[PDB]
């Protein structure tokens, strides 16, 4: 049986991303806005049970949980055409509707207050999952609901489901924009602390990189949350295609990520997408070659992760996994890997044998693909610690000024101290040190308390 995945969408940004993800998944699987498989969707070859539940013999319901501490977003979701696609028992809306006020501590306290109700909803959704693997949280780390409520939910899921994996898609605040939420770096720090202690994987989504990509590539001067959510939904669809297009290999998320996370501390994942095209350029299915794919993937403009420029750590690639979608020739893949090695197109870990893994994937048959070849890059690069170090620096910058800290001190999680921010800074420092060590042969002792 498929390993069902529960999708948790947290706060305004997380819930919008979850909604757009569910729309994209429905379109890829040929599910009507009511959750029913369309009559043209006769190819029963997709594994919906990994990501979707069947509401009836005909109706597929996304295994998606939309979670907010403010009712506005949940009500806006319930007003969409896809309201009937999801199982209503998997929808939890905070009765108070007040949100966390962009306060992580408030969100955590709200999650703790709704722990019983939230876990009852989660169990109700879980019974619809034949072989639920775990929960995926989509949230922002800068707000209150997606950061705080997300952290509380992550803690309670880790306590209740200690044998299930917990991956998060954590939207990080834009680091190039001055946040009006002066305590946003504190909220982000507390959320990163909880991700370090209670999450197993944090997918960092930098709103600054999303805005930059929308501006330069989509020509969007002010990227809306909705446009970012649609790009994220495209990325999520590509990441779930191997669940939606079953094959010989990589049929589960844990099998895919196992090669990427050697130690619990090295749980910071980077993303890549290919081909990157402007919406207008859908017309020409470009015959991108594996060599051409690899060349375009190496462009920072095509990487779905904004890692900071660490000047102190000689960041390197430990390993690379490329998930390629579309028509792929194995001999072309082999020649491409050969050329990459000869051209030293990939740097491997210095402490062990490492290479660029290449996965070839089919496109969804229900969704017409404008591109002959698409690709995801997964890479482990030590410079991702610099993103975490940058978040830590922002946290320290807010804490040293005590800016907007009185609002967090109103909530119990931050009422007495900012220890979650200091723990976040320490975790990011350890991550930086391990990432620098992971470029070195002494990575064999990286993460050992004597090395820490």
């Amino acid at each position: 049986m498929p390993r069902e995945i529960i999708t948790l969408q947290l706060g305004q940004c997380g819930n919008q991303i979850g909604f757009e993800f569910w729309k994209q998944l429905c379109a890829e699987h040929g599910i009507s806005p009511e959750g029913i498989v369309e009559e043209f969707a006769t190819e029963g070859t997709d594994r919906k049970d990994v990501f979707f539940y069947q509401a009836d013999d005909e109706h597929y319901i996304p295994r998606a949980v939309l979670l907010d501490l403010e009712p506005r977003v949940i009500h806006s979701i319930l007003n969409s055409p896809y309201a009937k696609l999801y199982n209503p028992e998997n929808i939890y809306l905070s009765e108070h509707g007040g949100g966390a006020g962009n306060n992580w501590a408030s969100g955590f306290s709200q999650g703790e207050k709704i722990h019983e109700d939230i876990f009852d909803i989660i169990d109700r959704e879980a019974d619809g999952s034949d072989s639920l693997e775990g929960f995926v949280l989509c949230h922002s780390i800068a707000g209150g609901t997606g950061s705080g409520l997300g952290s509380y939910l992550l803690e309670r899921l880790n306590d209740r489901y200690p044998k299930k994996l917990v991956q998060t898609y954590s939207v990080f605040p834009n680091q190039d924009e001055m946040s009006d939420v002066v305590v946003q770096p504190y909220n982000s720090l507390l959320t990163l602390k909880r991700l370090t202690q209670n999450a197993d994987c944090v997918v960092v989504l930098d709103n600054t990189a999303l805005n930059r990509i929308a501006t330069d590539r989509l020509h969007i001067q002010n990227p809306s949350f909705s446009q970012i959510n649609q790009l994220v939904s495209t990325i999520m669809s590509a990441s779930t295609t191997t669940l939606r297009y079953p094959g010989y290999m990589n049929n589960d998320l844990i099998g895919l990520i196992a090669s990427l996370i050697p130690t619990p501390r090295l749980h910071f994942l980077m993303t890549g997408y290919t081909p990157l095209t402007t919406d207008q350029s859908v017309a020409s299915v470009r015959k991108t070659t594996v060599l051409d794919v690899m060349r375009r993937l190496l462009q920072p403009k095509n990487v779905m992760v904004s890692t900071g420029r660490d000047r102190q750590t000689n960041h390197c690639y430990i390993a690379i996994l490329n998930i390629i979608q579309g028509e792929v020739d194995p001999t072309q893949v082999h020649k491409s890997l050969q050329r990459i090695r000869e051209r030293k197109l990939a740097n491997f870990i210095p402490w062990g044998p490492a290479s660029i893994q290449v996965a070839l994937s089919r496109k969804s048959p229900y969704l017409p693909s404008a591109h002959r070849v698409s690709g995801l890059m997964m890479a482990n690069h030590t410079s991702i610690s610099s993103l975490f170090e940058r978040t830590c620096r922002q946290y320290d910058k807010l804490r040293k000024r005590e800016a907007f800290l009185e609002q967090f001190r109103k909530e119990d999680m931050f009422k007495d101290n900012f220890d979650e921010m200091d723990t976040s800074r320490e975790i990011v420092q350890q991550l930086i040190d391990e990432y620098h060590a992971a470029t070195r042969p002494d990575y064999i002792s990286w993460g050992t308390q004597e090395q820490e």
Binding site: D292, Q338, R339, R343
Partner: protein, 133 residues
């Protein structure tokens, strides 16, 4: 039609006569550093992979007959191969033909040649003597 004589001539010009100058410029710019190594230190598979990667990365990728272009590693450096060619039209051809491949660890630049697979009966036109010249 079957032996694509004009296409074969265009391919020979592109590769043996360096007609695809942008392709050759790109290939030599990319491969000079690797080819600069001594022949004993050169990994032939690495040179072949770099050749194919430049070919796909150069304007030679736009040649419809580019797939007929092969890499040939001369057993002698470019200078010794050149001496053989210079002797070919001279009575020294037998002496250069019997000249041992230069013991000098030829740089990849000096060892670089193209090969072309001609099938019978098309191999009747692009013969080994013409290909060798």
């Amino acid at each position: 039609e079957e032996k694509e004589l004009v296409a074969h001539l265009r391919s020979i010009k592109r590769y043996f006569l360096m007609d695809q100058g942008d392709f050759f410029v790109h290939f030599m710019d990319l491969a000079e550093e690797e080819l600069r190594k001594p022949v004993e230190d050169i990994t032939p598979p690495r040179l072949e992979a770099l050749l194919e990667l430049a070919l796909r990365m150069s304007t030679a990728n736009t040649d419809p007959f580019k797939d007929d272009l092969k890499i040939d590693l001369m057993p002698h450096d470019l200078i010794t191969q050149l001496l053989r060619v210079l002797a070919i039209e001279t009575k020294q051809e037998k002496a250069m033909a019997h000249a041992d491949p230069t013991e000098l660890a030829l740089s990849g630049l000096e060892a670089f040649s193209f090969d072309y697979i001609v099938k019978w009966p098309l191999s009747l036109i692009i013969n080994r003597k013409a290909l060798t010249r």
